[PDB]
Amino acid sequence: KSYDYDLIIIGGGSGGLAAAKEAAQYGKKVMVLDFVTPTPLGTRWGLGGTCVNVGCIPKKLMHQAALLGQALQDSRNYGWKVEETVKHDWDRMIEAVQNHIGSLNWGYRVALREKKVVYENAYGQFIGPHRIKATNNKGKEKIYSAERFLIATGERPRYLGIPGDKEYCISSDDLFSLPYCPGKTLVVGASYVALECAGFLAGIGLDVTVMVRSILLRGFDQDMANKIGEHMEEHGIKFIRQFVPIKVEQIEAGTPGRLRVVAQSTNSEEIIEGEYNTVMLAIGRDACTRKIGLETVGVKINEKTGKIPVTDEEQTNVPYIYAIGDILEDKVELTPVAIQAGRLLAQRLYAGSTVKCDYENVPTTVFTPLEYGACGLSEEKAVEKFGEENIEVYHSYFWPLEWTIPSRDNNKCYAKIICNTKDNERVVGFHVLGPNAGEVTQGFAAALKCGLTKKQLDSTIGIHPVCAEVFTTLSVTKRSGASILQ
Amino acid sequence: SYDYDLIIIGGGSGGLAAAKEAAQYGKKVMVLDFVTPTPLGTRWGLGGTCVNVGCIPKKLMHQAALLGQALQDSRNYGWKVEETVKHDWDRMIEAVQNHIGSLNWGYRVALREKKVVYENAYGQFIGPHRIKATNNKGKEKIYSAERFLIATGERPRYLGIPGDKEYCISSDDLFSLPYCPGKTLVVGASYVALECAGFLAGIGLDVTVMVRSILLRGFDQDMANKIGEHMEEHGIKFIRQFVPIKVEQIEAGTPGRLRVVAQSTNSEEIIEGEYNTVMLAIGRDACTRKIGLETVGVKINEKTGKIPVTDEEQTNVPYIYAIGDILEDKVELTPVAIQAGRLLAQRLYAGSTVKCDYENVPTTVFTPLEYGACGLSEEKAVEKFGEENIEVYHSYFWPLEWTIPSRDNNKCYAKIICNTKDNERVVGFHVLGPNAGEVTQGFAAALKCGLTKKQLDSTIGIHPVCAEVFTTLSVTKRSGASILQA
Ligand SMILES: Cc1cc2nc3c(=O)[nH]c(=O)nc-3n(C[C@H](O)[C@H](O)[C@H](O)COP(=O)(O)OP(=O)(O)OC[C@H]3O[C@@H](n4cnc5c(N)ncnc54)[C@H](O)[C@@H]3O)c2cc1C
Ligand SMILES: Cc1cc2nc3c(=O)[nH]c(=O)nc-3n(C[C@H](O)[C@H](O)[C@H](O)COP(=O)(O)OP(=O)(O)OC[C@H]3O[C@@H](n4cnc5c(N)ncnc54)[C@H](O)[C@@H]3O)c2cc1C
Ligand SMILES: NC(=O)c1ccc[n+]([C@@H]2O[C@H](COP(=O)([O-])OP(=O)(O)OC[C@@H]3O[C@@H](n4cnc5c(N)ncnc54)[C@H](OP(=O)(O)O)[C@@H]3O)[C@@H](O)[C@H]2O)c1
Ligand SMILES: NC(=O)c1ccc[n+]([C@@H]2O[C@H](COP(=O)([O-])OP(=O)(O)OC[C@@H]3O[C@@H](n4cnc5c(N)ncnc54)[C@H](OP(=O)(O)O)[C@@H]3O)[C@@H](O)[C@H]2O)c1
Fold this sequence. Notes:
Radius of gyration of chain A: 24 Å
Structural class of chain A: alpha/beta
Helix content of chain A: 25-40%
Oligomer: homodimer
CATH superfamily of the largest domain in chain A: FAD/NAD(P)-binding domain
GO cellular component, one term (chain B): nucleoplasm
Bound molecules: flavin-adenine dinucleotide, NADP nicotinamide-adenine-dinucleotide phosphate
Subunit structure (chain B): Homodimer. Interacts with HERC5.
Largest sheet of chain A: 7 strands, mixed
Number of helices of chain A: 12
CATH architecture of the largest domain in chain A: 3-Layer(bba) Sandwich
CATH topology of the largest domain in chain A: FAD/NAD(P)-binding domain
PDB class: oxidoreductase
EC number (chain B): 1.8.1.9, 1.11.1.2
Organism (chain B): Homo sapiens (Human)
């Protein structure tokens, strides 16, 4: 065994870098490859991956801006001398956000440089067994070999295929660094990315509209999804139901130009047009598994979804090649899990760890104007598994004390758990719509990993006055009809 | 036979919870709540200590300090909000109060709706099953009940020095001061002392804290010190090992001018200085003395004032029970008072065999940098399982939100305590950071489930949320590895 690297990692994102750092921690000579292919409009960025640059970080930060705005309103009723002269500066904001992104890029680049991990800013490509072609930025190609390979390329934003979409529209990739303020914009899609973005754009004071093909947050508990939508609507975000863009024309040009979106319902022959300054398409992402020469090494992938089938140890059909993160099939497209898989994989390969990555009950939270945290089965899925008559739902509204003197949004925040009667009222589903949803959810996710039961939950004393406490004493069920409108 | 099935003395957190519950079972119940005036005349409405002069007003004002800080942040996120904004003490108070007012009344409607008699009179035992109810204007009345529940809670304790009752204020007076405290001195180092000093400071005032010995006695001292350091780092001045010997009125007025003179606990040193207000946050004394416990023969720890009770909150006298703060060797917290109250009722009038679990009751101090905790402290962990059997995995974290406002890095801290002799059981949870309570709640449930370090690691964290830091704790204090490089 005398290859170039002990392990070559393709992709320097959440998983890639986590894997790289672990392995290195054990001496294994590792090399990471990372290359960012520009968006149809020319956007590109530094080391880090989706989240670090065009995902979570920028997303959460801007969501904080919208939140801070709302705080400026609350400060008044608390005795702070602030007016409504609260006007936003999109550039000044983006300027801060991007600058922070700069730092992360350099931080990440330095963690490796100091961990004895080689970093090459080149596009990887398998050419043959244990062999990979590394095309650099200026076309210069180079060839490396390694005992093992880790595929962690992640995904990129998808398109509609309609006319003008790639020429006049923007994706999550372009959004977080737009040189100009989006202005009145339309958001096509209803995934968390779609809603999160629409929400903070709106929260930042813009005119936002959301075009929905079918339902909201397909995949999550629909009851929650609707409440999230209602809050958004109740606040100004406009929704267009069951429609999809068919064309996009540049009525006028200029930083935020004038776009002429045309679209048509599904169920009907109806067709409508509208105008906007920006059009952000948030209709999902496609794995970057096609153009990497998986053939030259013989790695099977779900030719349809682009996803890579993998053993419960993140191993592909090819024994020396593994896959981690979003590109994986029937797993969970989340940054924290990508890092676990990455780090545990390394531990198993170079430390005799027999620990496997647990993709069950992975907690999650959507950062819409009204944050939604969750962990475990959704309501519909809970019945679809244990039988409608074996699960009881305990729900209740709650009021963030921080909201009483500002005097707003009562009976809006909602919480609910899902228990399986045939198993000691096991808490199999956890949902909360309210401020700091994530902070509230984390701990409970740990509780589920411990088999939290309704009895144990009740026996836990809540903390006063903290939102979360609403979860320690819930007795009104859905199968009792009891009205919880207080 | 008797006038009532159950007469409850004290209409606070426990009292009302007990009343409302017990009533739910067609029991003829009555609540007696009387607020004896403060040394300076301050009084308030139904609800107990938490509603009027406790949690609620405390948390709310703490939110005012927070909102102020947010006004600062907004600027770096693209909000045109001039640095330096004035705060209105009077405005804020008027708002808090109105909220408490709304509450007082609310609870009033709660009891009556559930057919619970409420009498605004001071209760007093006069003989077996007999109680004297002295009303506001001296008119006394006498009632009898099959059972009695003592839930009188406590009240602020004074030093005993000259001028303390005539020129100083307590938590009781603070939340409704008709004038802005101005430069003030806070005597004490309990959570009440620190919380108040903190928000007063956060509201823009000159605050000083006089400490007799250590900070937050009873709490993990490592945490306590970090909390103090943050406070000091922000302007709150501390005077170590000194106790007020006497306070004199240099002047009078709304914001008055008092002189304080205190002496060392170490040496003979004696010191003094001008202060507009002087708050004495040095603990509370149970209201168990002046209620005629003799006439019915209920034994109490004559020294502490607390009331010894069985594991069902039953006193030595079979028809008399006690709940809440006045209890001995338990936890003085609103949420527990309500559990004891609600479960006691369920046991007495619903055949419930469930007992109140005072073990691992989660808690969180609302200092400028919130501190949440649950379980054994570090020092106590060793004092129980032996220093070599406990692991301390810790780490600093920096809330995403402080990245662009670029402030307070390497300040937020988290740590768990595991017992090696028991699968690295998580026996102690601590977190210093924003929204400490929201983060802690869930974990407290996890402990009730026996959370183990292995289970914790197997839990996937939510990104980018503060709480997540706990899902990957790897650096232990013993493996004396610096973590102060974040
Ligand atoms: C708008 C948005 C918001 C999100 N918000 C959250 C959130 O709040 N929380 C959360 O947990 N997750 C969030 N995610 C998802 C998160 O970003 C992904 O789960 C995570 O990045 C996946 O890890 P990965 O390792 O697969 O890397 P990326 O997905 O980090 O993939 C690796 C990188 O390598 C590049 N690459 C691909 N092929 C090659 C090659 N051949 N050579 C070199 N480089 C290559 C990729 O284009 C990319 O830059 C969000 C995603 C988006 C789009
Ligand atoms: C500054 C401060 C901050 C606090 N912050 C928090 C916090 O964040 N979270 C938390 O959980 N707890 C907090 N607490 C404590 C919490 O409020 C108490 O633990 C809780 O109120 C105790 O419950 P209780 O039932 O004993 O009622 P109170 O202690 O609510 O007692 C009930 C009532 O009975 C009255 N009474 C007394 N004697 C008689 C009599 N003879 N006849 C009739 N009525 C009588 C009292 O005056 C009072 O109105 C705080 C306390 C203080 C002082
Ligand atoms: N769907 C699930 O149950 C589920 C659960 C967990 C993980 N996943 C992962 O998510 C993948 C699905 O693709 P994805 O990640 O790119 O997106 P996504 O997160 O599944 O879905 C985003 C949503 O995309 C919209 N959308 C997709 N194509 C569209 C189009 N052509 N026009 C308009 N709207 C469109 C959806 O419309 P609709 O309202 O019509 O859906 C909806 O708004 C799966 O293959 C899997 O890897 C799916
Ligand atoms: N030793 C005890 O205090 C004690 C004994 C038995 C039971 N308990 C339990 O603890 C609960 C809380 O006790 P608590 O209400 O007395 O106060 P506390 O909340 O325990 O403590 C407040 C803190 O009070 C300070 N303090 C107390 N007396 C003071 C004085 N004369 N001058 C200056 N500072 C003073 C303490 O200093 P120091 O840190 O120097 O004390 C410290 O700042 C009780 O209700 C009971 O359940 C406490």
